[PDB]
């Protein structure tokens, strides 16, 4: 998975992610109106939304759970794989605000209007364990969260504490911890976006064979560490050189560079790990844009076209049928 | 630029390319019916098409010139930048079939039905450069040529001779020469598509942080050499692991990985080098598919929907306006 | 700087380091007998050695300070540059065992006989600030420490606490923190010491051009991170494949690979950063071996040839005159 | 293998090599006086030296054969492995000066006084392989040739012709061909010897963790291609930044960086590929300096201390016993 936040030329804030998995999870686009009571049947825990919510997720026994999404106030959240350095509690911890893993994303979007508000409540940070239905393998996720102010945070629970990092890079991938990746960026201070055309190697003239010589040493593989480096510098270069050109499609160009391709990232179970979908949320406008591995045309779902005071959850079918424009 | 040939799960042959430039060249989709006389006004040289032609190009003084394209027989050709090791003749060479740089692509598609037929004629093709209008020369462009048999060749003119290479890799980028890139592939025999989960480092247990550890060492920059390596192995992995899944969208996933992003590949004139468009030709079906930097939705132009015995050149506007599917 | 611990074929333990600096620090080999009172004149703080000490250091106002060294019990310690993530206290902290930076190395060797003994006292870990003479810029260092049991630790003081890590890698370099480097090792689980001779790239046969294809992707620069990776895997390969060949010279072969060469690592003050010397201590034998940038012949100083019950500090001149064997 | 030419601060020319093999070849230092008749007993071919010769080699049936060496005029030659792209003739070619593989090195040094003189004679050197005894062929070895003018050439026989390249890089390794490596150097024009201390990544300050950030992207493995890149740039940096510091030991520092270490470069027969010895010839002085994997102290054999008009071949035992300076 790769997360990304970006500000457009018109001053709008985009937030989204690549979902990188080798399987389907019965996902669909889920809309939840405000003042809507969600009740988990397996453990009888309930949640009533304060704000309307839209994003990608799935439904277990009528209970919604999200992979990423936004609310009507322009707060966004995305849950990304975090397999090694995560540690949830096996049961509730006394005195803490205990949040079940599966419910964290909805908890953020349903209750809060800004990053600053989320930050105070997370101090409170508790990604313990709790199921949802009857079974299911409750995993992990390393959190961020972004809003209309342009500020982003990353949320990671380790064995010692629930960590909340200010994210000044504007990106996230997977393991290891966020502070590891930030220090790793320092290894690449020698990268240059500008062409290096020549090098006088004593008696030998060295001339660049093509464009791109300044970035030689950029890692090309699909590990979380390498993808973090690539997206961080690609984002930086566009802001530095092309702040006034940034729009929706640029978000997709950045994430395409770190997208997984069929065949080349094989798991030990011999399945292909893919970038299954790419989402981009325009936070001010309440529009969830996404495309999929099967269909690259961007699909838009606008929450403002729904009844925010409605009484039903609405779902939209995950689009995996390629849409072509037939010109003649 | 990056060229690619691929065979689908249904046994159809795809051939296409990324066009990587920092400027516009007034390009449009050009269709030319068969038995059509093209006359260059500047030098009075004429060409009558034997086969109907479709592809991307531009028109100078009513004379068409192509960047890539296909013919009705399922022969495809693409012209890619080749700035360093190219050497055209300044005037015609005696006894040779002299082809002007700008006219090479049309010469291939208008006259021949297969790679084998092109191969025999090329034994002799002096790229003596000579304008066709005004004083705007040609390109460093090297040509990849492929057909419905699945076979591809690479054409490169050096100071010594016109080289025609059999292409068993299925890809092409830019400089240096084709034999250089093929030998460079040998440096990467240690790459693995399968996950390496652990490594016992004596008293220390090393465990993979995420998927993709087998491809560590893959170069991530946007130079011609690095892009050649990436596309060669990504193509190999999909054929080896997912031969029966290969379809149209897979072609685009491969080329997306080596696409240039705004801001990060800057020329010495401080302009952003971009992947302006990506074309994919289905050779058996006569369909030219393409998208652009601005609009990622794939557009299809089918030559079989035109009159192949027509008497007019037809053009289609280059689509650079984002096409979104509004779901609700 | 690069630190290294190794066990020989005869079961002896070697511990040493490269010193990588762009300047001289008036270094010499220093021997201190046991029961010897050292008194810092500037701050009147005193230390009486319990064990005899030998190593590289310098003397300020008759007070010895060490860069690396060993004691008569087979305990070794080396102080390596740690510029970014270090944080000493400006004055003594109440209730703690406060150790001045310049005195840490002597404190370890003078007082303790084993890693286990040092570990308990460091819990106690205090690399605060304190001068020595009157001026001088009290720097930082990230600690380890190794003994005759084969076990090593790393000692690093951050803003939060004095960290003591068990070192199962057997190596150390510089910044960032030790836990960062250990996690970074996980990126390289795909490395192979064994030759990969061929790769079937579909229709193209790829054959290795020379030996070493399994390690493609190993970083070649002279940053602390890259040197950590190289030394960790070079050490691992020799233990795995050649445990019974390990002797003195093998230690130097490993460290040579990460040694800095004149001209290629330039500071911002335009000076060349060099591997000024390489030391190797045979802990059971009480012999300090070393060579220098100027003289690669290994020099041996044996503490057992001195009077351990003596009453004088003894010094030996740093050898920077190349020693050649004239055969004829 | 790695070859290197260097000019000292006093204007003297050094020429030498690493020998990288996994076995012993009964090597010794061989001196041959001038006007000495060497006769191969197996094929009755004879050679009378015009100039006295000194270098590393072995003797088969009283016939000497060299791996590297120099003559009394200051001409040097080194034979390096060249396994893939070499092609010797199976028998003599008519009209050519046919040189047996095993005899090439001696042929150069015995007959010629300069690079220019060798160049003219090579216009024609058919490496038709033919034994000189038993059935133990020759090597993939390619030859670097250098003299007191500071000029070097590279000699490579392919299927088409005997190639003689001017060497303006000052280095050589193994396969592929010399022109491949020279073009490969162009990929690394973005390397910098000077420290890059910081990088402003938008809202995030990136600061170098240690020295060496300008060379990130330098390959660290032991393949011929990677070693070529390293030695080329390390040599360049020292000449550019430290021309007036260059002496004998600097030569060894450069070659140490590309030396193979026990355990980490394993062949398919599971043997460790090592840098068995490193030679350095001072061409003006007639001194052959060398050390070995086992003994790093430099040994000097001066041909001017021998009788150049003598009547016997003289040999010196290959030194593989560690020579330590015991200080106390």
Distance, in Å, from the CA atom of D56 to the CA atom of D54, rounded to the nearest integer, reads 7
Q: How many Å apart are CA A143 and CA A164, to the nearest integer?
A: 8
SS3 of residue C219 by DSSP: strand
The alpha carbon of residue A180 is apart from the nearest alpha carbon of chain C, in Å, by 6
> Mutating which of B82, B85, B180 best tests the D interface, going by the most D Cβ atoms within 10 A?
B180
Q: Taking a C-beta distance cutoff of 8 angstroms, is the pair B299, B319 a contact? A: yes
Cβ atoms of residues B320 and B327 within 8 Å: no
Q: How far is A197 from chain C (nearest CA, A)?
A: 21
- Chain C residue numbers with beta carbons less than 8 Å from the beta carbon of D271 are none
| Smallest Cα distance from B274 to chain D, Å | 20
For residue A106, give the H/E element and its range: helix A104-111
Q: Which stretches of chain C sit within 8 Å of chain B by CB?
A: 168-170, 182-183, 185-192, 196-199, 201-204, 206-209, 213-217, 232-233, 235-236, 239-240
Binding residues of B for taurine: 81
**Subunit partners of chain C (3 or more CB pairs within 8 A):** A, B, D
Of B51, B14, B9, the C-alpha closest to B284 is: B14
Residues of C in contact with D215 (CB under 8 A): 220-222, 264-265
B84 and A209 within 8 Å at the Cβ level: the answer is yes
* Technique used to solve these coordinates: X-ray
Q: Which of A221, A227, A238 to mutate to test the interface with B (most CBs of B within 10 A)?
A: A221
CB contact under 8 A, B236 and C170: no
Interchain pair D215, A190: CB under 8 A: yes
C323 falls within a domain: no
Q: What are the DSSP E strand ranges found in A34-159?
A: 37-39, 46-48, 53-60, 63-71, 76-78, 152-157
Are the C-beta atoms of residues D139 and D101 closer than 8 Å to each other? Answer: yes
* Domain presence at residue A310: yes
Which among B166, B190, B233 is the top mutation candidate for probing chain C, defined by the most C β-carbons within 10 Å of its own β-carbon? B190
Q: Tell if the CB–CB gap between B199 and C188 is shorter than 8 Å.
A: yes
Tokens of C64: 């010895």
Number of folded domains that form chain C:
1
The gap from C-alpha C246 to its chain's centroid, in whole angstroms, comes to 19
Looking at the DSSP bridge assignments, the partners of residue B205 are: B200
Active site annotation includes A282: no
Q: Is residue A198 part of a domain?
A: yes
What are the residues facing D97 on neighbouring strands?
Answer: D125
Selected catalytic residue, list A1, A77, A280, A282: A1
Instruction: Flag if C216 and B186 touch (Cβ within 8 Å).
Output: no
Whole-number Å distance between alpha carbons of C127 and C141: 9
The distance of Cα C177 from the centroid of its chain, to the nearest Å, equals 16
Q: Does the distance separating the beta carbons of D299 and C268 come in below 8 Å?
A: no
Q: Are the beta carbons of C265 and D211 separated by less than 8 Å?
A: yes
- Catalytic residue, candidates D1, D38, D77, D282: D1
CATH, residue D42:
3.60.60.10
The distance of C313 to chain B (nearest Cα, Å) reads 39
β-sheet bridge partners, residue D199: D206
Q: Indicate the DSSP class of residue A255.
A: H
C53 membership: H or E segment, kind and range: strand C53-60
Contact B241 A262 (CB under 8 A): yes
Q: Residue C229 in contact with residue C184, Cβ under 8 Å?
A: yes
Residues of D in contact with A186 (CB under 8 A): 206-209
Helix, strand, or coil (residue D123): coil
Please name the member of C176, C242, C295 whose beta carbon is closest to the beta carbon of D262: C242
B166 Cβ contact list (under 8 Å, min separation 6): B151, B152, B153
| B75 located within any domain | yes
Chain C residues inside the 8 Å CB shell of D174 = 209-210
Does residue B327 lie in a domain region?
Answer: no
Instruction: Provide the edge-to-edge strand list for the sheet that holds C274-282.
Output: C171-172, C2-7, C13-21, C274-282, C287-292, C299-302, D325-326
Decide if A324 is inside a domain. no
Q: Rounded to a whole number, what is the distance in angstroms from the first to the last CA of chain B?
A: 38
CB within 8 Å: D184 and B183: no
Cα distance between residue C58 and residue C49, in whole Å: 17
Residue-wise DSSP of A162-189: EEEEEESS-EE-SSS-HHHHHHHGGGGT
For residue C187, list chain A residues with Cβ-Cβ distance below 8 A. Answer: 223, 225
One DSSP character per residue, A309-327 reads T-SS-EEEE---S---EE-
**Nearest residue in C to D239, CA atom:** C263
- Residue D158: CB atoms within 10 Å: 12
* Within-domain flag for B328: no
Size of interface B-C (CB pairs under 8 A): 95
Q: In this complex, which chains have at least 3 CB pairs below 8 Å with chain B? A: A, C, D
Q: A20 lies in which domain range?
A: 1-318
User: Cβ of C6: how many Cβ atoms within 10 Å?
Assistant: 23
E strand or H helix at C282, and its extent? strand C274-282
In angstroms, this model's resolution equals 2.1
Annotated binding site of B for deoxycholate: 1, 17
> Is A158 part of any domain?
yes
* DSSP reduced 3-state for D38: strand
Burial B292-316 (b: 16+ CB within 10 A, else e): bbbbbbbbbbbbeebeeeeeeebeb
Q: What are the helix and strand counts (H, E) for chain C?
A: 5, 18
SS3 A293: coil
């Amino acid at each position: 998975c790769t997360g990304l936040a970006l500000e457009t030329k018109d001053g709008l804030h985009l937030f989204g992610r690549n979902m990188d998995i080798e399987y389907s999870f019965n996902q669909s686009i889920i809309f939840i109106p405000r003042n809507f009571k969600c009740v988990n049947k397996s453990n009888k825990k309930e949640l009533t939304t304060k704000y309307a919510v839209l994003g990608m997720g799935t439904i277990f026994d009528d209970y919604p759970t999200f992979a990423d999404g936004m609310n009507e106030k322009g707060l966004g959240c995305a849950g990304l794989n975090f397999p090694v350095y995560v540690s949830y509690s096996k049961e509730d911890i006394e005195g803490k605000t205990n949040i079940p893993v599966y419910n964290f994303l909805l908890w953020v979007l349903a209750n809060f209007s800004s990053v600053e508000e989320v930050k105070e409540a997370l101090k409170n940070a508790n990604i313990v364990d709790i199921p949802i239905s009857e079974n299911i393998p409750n995993t992990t996720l390393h959190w961020m969260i972004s809003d209309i102010t342009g500020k982003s945070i990353v949320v990671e629970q380790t064995k010692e504490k629930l960590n909340v990092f200010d994210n000044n890079i504007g990106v996230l991938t997977n393991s290891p911890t966020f502070d590891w990746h930030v220090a790793n960026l320092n290894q690449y201070v020698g990268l240059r976006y500008n062409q290096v055309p020549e090098f006088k190697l004593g008696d030998q003239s060295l001339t660049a064979l093509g464009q791109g010589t300044g970035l030689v040493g950029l890692p090309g593989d699909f590990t979380p560490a390498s993808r973090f480096i690539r997206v961080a510098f690609l984002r930086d270069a566009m802001i530095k050189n092309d702040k006034d050109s940034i729009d929706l499609i640029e978000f997709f160009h950045i994430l395409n560079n770190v997208a997984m391709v069929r065949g080349s990232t094989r798991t030990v179970e011999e399945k292909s790990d893919l970038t299954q979908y790419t989402s981009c949320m325009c936070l001010e406008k309440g529009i969830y844009y996404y495309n999929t591995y099967e269909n690259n045309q961007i699909n838009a779902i606008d929450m403002n076209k729904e009844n925010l005071d409605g009484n039903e959850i609405k779902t939209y079918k995950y689009n995996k049928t390629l849409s072509i424009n037939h010109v003649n």
